């Protein structure tokens, strides 16, 4: 269960690719996270986004260990 602060750290890390498309997995081995902008928020400019309203997260499990 990754904390919201750690999820926000990944959002900042991939700030250049953050979109409504699921991000790459945060790790290449083990349990990581994937993040995206909600499809229903696709038409909001970047500065009008909000973590609690507009961001989705899901767990990913990579096997390249």
């Amino acid at each position, epitope marked *: 269960e990754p904390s919201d602060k750690h999820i926000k750290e990944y959002l900042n890390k991939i700030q250049n690719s953050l979109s409504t498309e699921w991000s790459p997995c945060s790790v290449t081995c083990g349990n990581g996270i994937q993040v995206r902008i909600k499809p229903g928020s696709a038409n909001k400019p*970047k500065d009008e986004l909000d973590y609690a309203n507009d961001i989705e997260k899901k767990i990913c499990k990579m096997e390249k260990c």
Partner: antibody
Amino acid sequence: EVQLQESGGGLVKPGGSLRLSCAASGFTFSSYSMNWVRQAPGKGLEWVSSITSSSSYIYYADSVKGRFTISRDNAKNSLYLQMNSLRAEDTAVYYCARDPGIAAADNHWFDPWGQGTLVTVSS
Amino acid sequence: YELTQPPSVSVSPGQTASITCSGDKLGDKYACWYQQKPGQSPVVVIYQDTKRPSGIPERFSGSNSGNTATLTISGTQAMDEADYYCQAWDSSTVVFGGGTKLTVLG
């Protein structure tokens, strides 16, 4: 060169009105959230108001709610602060500030700041 | 939401200055730090808890966890004397700490 230049400060009577402007250059003004911050002489920084790129979301500090109105004209690369019902305690240097943060991560900071313009509320 | 800083921190030249900024679950937020010298506009020296803008001397570092964001100046020089303000964000409201005046003694 990213630059913000405030104008409109000066002396204003108690209860009077004053409009500050902030001219932006060197960045795509129309896509950034913009902020006003003030600092009373010898005191600290106090956030005043914010407005997003499209003006769709606006917020005020409780100390100015109902008296100040923030606005912007993207075609003119300009940010405005209309100040009404001014009181002696609104005397401060008023700063224009750009927010180049990552709103999706709730990550907000100000850079750059304008040079500030001094508003003196006095009889 | 309120942020609290010590009013004054003093340090000898070349020593480390530790300036704190405190608030309820501050570590769950992003903190940034502004430097203000007399008669000048504030300048960000740390943002996003730990990030240093280009042009800011490498001796400025930052951290944020728990209920404390910490601005650390290693090998403090006289030119680092200034007021330092922390700043965070709470429900679209921007909050500033009250400021810390850094004095380089000796």
